[PDB]
Amino acid sequence: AHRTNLIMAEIIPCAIYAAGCFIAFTFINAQTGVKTTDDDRVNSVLRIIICTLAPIAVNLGVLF
Amino acid sequence: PGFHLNNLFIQLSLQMFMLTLVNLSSLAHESIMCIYDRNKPKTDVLVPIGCYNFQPAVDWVRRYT
């Protein structure tokens, strides 16, 4: 049906705003003010996903 | 309906402007800065070398405010 694909449109505005924060959090961790070290790897995405999922997992375990 | 639309659009404007403010605050904090006024010549370098000019970024803040 067209209604099913039609309903999920309302999520595209508020999802973009989420990415709007996600960049602002990465940039400071990018250390671009000082001369950036080459071929060194580091990440924060796992921190973000565990932050977003852990309280939900805790609540679900409580419900269980 | 126009009052309802204005009411939505005001809060919408603050929310987008506030996102833009956060982006600018990160971009200004991470970078080195240079300050100048309206007495600038046609084009010249400033006292420190390799800096980035963002004074219109904060003048837009005053104008929008």
Ligand SMILES: CCCCCCCCCCCCCCCC(=O)OC[C@H](COP(=O)(O)OCCN)OC(=O)CCCCCCCCCCCCCCC
């Ligand atoms: C909270 C629940 C409601 C909010 C979330 C749902 C509404 C947002 C997502 C729905 C998808 C619609 C996309 C725009 C329509 C479109 O695509 O029309 C297509 C046209 C073409 O665009 P263009 O001129 O840029 O030409 C293309 C140039 N590249 O748009 C326009 O002419 C601009 C008019 C935008 C619509 C005006 C009304 C929307 C604001 C009111 C809705 C929010 C509050 C409702 C009251 C409570």
Ligand SMILES: CCCCCCCCCCCCCCCC(=O)O
């Ligand atoms: C891309 C054009 C609009 C710019 C972004 C509009 C603001 C996004 C939605 C506001 C933040 C989230 C609050 C609304 C919650 C939601 O319905 O997703």
Ligand SMILES: CCCCCCCCCCCCCCCC(=O)O
């Ligand atoms: C939150 C709205 C601001 C726009 C940032 C969200 C979407 C990012 C798209 C622009 C950057 C990606 C395109 C250029 C970089 C690339 O080609 O990978």
Ligand SMILES: CCCCCCC
């Ligand atoms: C441009 C429409 C935005 C819908 C979300 C408003 C909070």
